[PDB]
Design a protein around this motif. Structure first.
Motif, PDB file in Angstrom:
ATOM      1  N   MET A 197       0.825  -1.245   0.000  1.00 45.95           N
ATOM      2  CA  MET A 197       0.000   0.000   0.000  1.00 45.95           C
ATOM      3  C   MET A 197       0.842   1.270   0.000  1.00 45.95           C
ATOM      4  O   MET A 197       0.321   2.358  -0.233  1.00 45.95           O
ATOM      5  CB  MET A 197      -0.954  -0.006   1.200  1.00 45.95           C
ATOM      6  CG  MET A 197      -0.296   0.104   2.581  1.00 45.95           C
ATOM      7  SD  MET A 197       0.513   1.672   2.971  1.00 45.95           S
ATOM      8  CE  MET A 197      -0.903   2.707   3.319  1.00 45.95           C
TER       9      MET A 197
ATOM     10  N   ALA B  83       0.048   3.238  -2.613  1.00 40.93           N
ATOM     11  CA  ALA B  83      -1.120   4.087  -2.408  1.00 40.93           C
ATOM     12  C   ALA B  83      -0.735   5.401  -1.748  1.00 40.93           C
ATOM     13  O   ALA B  83      -1.248   6.461  -2.126  1.00 40.93           O
ATOM     14  CB  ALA B  83      -2.166   3.358  -1.564  1.00 40.93           C
ATOM     15  N   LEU B  84       0.164   5.359  -0.764  1.00 40.94           N
ATOM     16  CA  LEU B  84       0.663   6.591  -0.170  1.00 40.94           C
ATOM     17  C   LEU B  84       1.583   7.339  -1.126  1.00 40.94           C
ATOM     18  O   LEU B  84       1.654   8.571  -1.074  1.00 40.94           O
ATOM     19  CB  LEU B  84       1.392   6.290   1.140  1.00 40.94           C
ATOM     20  CG  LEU B  84       1.914   7.505   1.908  1.00 40.94           C
ATOM     21  CD1 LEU B  84       0.769   8.406   2.342  1.00 40.94           C
ATOM     22  CD2 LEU B  84       2.721   7.060   3.111  1.00 40.94           C
TER      23      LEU B  84
ATOM     24  N   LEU C 221      -0.206   9.701  -3.205  1.00 35.38           N
ATOM     25  CA  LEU C 221      -0.838  10.792  -2.473  1.00 35.38           C
ATOM     26  C   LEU C 221      -0.732  12.113  -3.221  1.00 35.38           C
ATOM     27  O   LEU C 221      -1.479  13.049  -2.918  1.00 35.38           O
ATOM     28  CB  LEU C 221      -0.195  10.914  -1.090  1.00 35.38           C
ATOM     29  CG  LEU C 221      -0.754  11.952  -0.117  1.00 35.38           C
ATOM     30  CD1 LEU C 221      -2.229  11.716   0.151  1.00 35.38           C
ATOM     31  CD2 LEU C 221       0.042  11.910   1.178  1.00 35.38           C
TER      32      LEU C 221
ATOM     33  N   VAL D 271       0.697  17.094   4.906  1.00 34.39           N
ATOM     34  CA  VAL D 271      -0.114  16.318   3.979  1.00 34.39           C
ATOM     35  C   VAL D 271      -0.659  15.110   4.724  1.00 34.39           C
ATOM     36  O   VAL D 271       0.092  14.363   5.361  1.00 34.39           O
ATOM     37  CB  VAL D 271       0.711  15.899   2.749  1.00 34.39           C
ATOM     38  CG1 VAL D 271      -0.195  15.313   1.677  1.00 34.39           C
ATOM     39  CG2 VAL D 271       1.489  17.085   2.203  1.00 34.39           C
TER      40      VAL D 271
ATOM     41  N   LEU E 121      -3.802  11.864   5.014  1.00 40.18           N
ATOM     42  CA  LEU E 121      -4.603  10.924   4.246  1.00 40.18           C
ATOM     43  C   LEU E 121      -5.566  10.198   5.173  1.00 40.18           C
ATOM     44  O   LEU E 121      -5.232   9.909   6.325  1.00 40.18           O
ATOM     45  CB  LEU E 121      -3.708   9.914   3.517  1.00 40.18           C
ATOM     46  CG  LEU E 121      -4.406   8.818   2.711  1.00 40.18           C
ATOM     47  CD1 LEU E 121      -5.220   9.413   1.575  1.00 40.18           C
ATOM     48  CD2 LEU E 121      -3.380   7.833   2.176  1.00 40.18           C
TER      49      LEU E 121
ATOM     50  N   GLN F 103      -5.923   4.430   7.138  1.00 39.37           N
ATOM     51  CA  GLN F 103      -5.485   3.189   6.524  1.00 39.37           C
ATOM     52  C   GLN F 103      -5.907   2.006   7.393  1.00 39.37           C
ATOM     53  O   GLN F 103      -6.520   2.167   8.450  1.00 39.37           O
ATOM     54  CB  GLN F 103      -3.971   3.205   6.320  1.00 39.37           C
ATOM     55  CG  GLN F 103      -3.514   4.184   5.254  1.00 39.37           C
ATOM     56  CD  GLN F 103      -3.813   3.689   3.857  1.00 39.37           C
ATOM     57  OE1 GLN F 103      -4.163   2.526   3.663  1.00 39.37           O
ATOM     58  NE2 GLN F 103      -3.677   4.570   2.873  1.00 39.37           N
TER      59      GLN F 103
END
Lengths: 56, 39, 68, 56
Positions: B1, B4-5, B8, C49, C51, C54
């Protein structure tokens, strides 16, 4: 008149909602001086020679 | 993953590409990584 | 996220909860920290930044093909 | 306890913060006399609440 300025550096961060942050950047302010010099008859020459020699 | 980061930075994942060779081409089974030579 | 010296320890991968209920109307969400831009002695702020949450491993499917 | 006619003014004293970074002081003479200044004060409310980030 003689003009003198004592300058700090203090960054302020203000959020969207007006919440404020404070950060003094200079521990001791940096100092500047100003004056109007009006000289003539061998005093103008002294000022000119000295200032040209010093420069920076 | 971590891909996936890594994405970003995207503007929002479909892909179409060929590969830069990795250690897949097989001539010795490895139940664990002992690395390998390169010849 | 634009941040003052409130997250100076916060490091990429950290976790934090953000709330903007009275302007953007987002309900106190938990976020994963990504890239961080530490500031200089001027300009104060740090850009974070971030997100959405997860996840770890867990069991949903039973895909053991079990060849013959 | 005082009478209504016992006051000069009821001027506001809000939370204030000096606006400009460098202070201009006009020394029309040596320190003994005229040294006027033109400060600017920014009045607001300090809002941020500091619950320092734990486990630093």
């Amino acid at each position: 008149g003689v003009t003198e300025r004592i300058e700090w550096q203090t960054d302020v961060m203000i959020s969207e909602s007006g919440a404020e942050q404070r950060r003094p950047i200079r521990l001791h302010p940096r100092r500047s001086f100003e004056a109007t010099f009006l000289r003539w008859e061998e005093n103008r020459t002294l000022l000119d020679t000295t200032i040209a020699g010093v420069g920076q | 993953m971590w891909w996936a980061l890594a994405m970003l930075v995207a503007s929002v994942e479909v892909w179409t590409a060929d590969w830069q060779v990795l250690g897949f081409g097989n001539f010795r089974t490895k139940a664990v990584k002992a690395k390998q030579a390169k010849k | 996220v634009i941040c003052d010296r409130r997250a100076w320890n916060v490091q990429p991968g950290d976790v934090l909860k953000v709330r903007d209920p009275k302007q953007r109307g987002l309900t106190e969400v938990v976020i994963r920290v990504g890239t961080v831009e530490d500031g200089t002695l001027p300009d104060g702020k740090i850009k974070v930044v971030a997100l959405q949450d997860q996840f770890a491993f867990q069991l949903n499917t039973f895909n053991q093909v079990e060849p013959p | 306890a005082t009478s209504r006619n016992d006051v000069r003014r009821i001027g506001y004293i809000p939370v204030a913060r000096l606006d400009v970074d460098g202070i201009e002081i006009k020394r029309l003479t040596d320190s003994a006399g005229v040294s006027q200044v033109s400060l600017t004060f920014k009045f607001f409310d300090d809002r941020r609440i500091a619950t320092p980030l734990p486990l630093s």
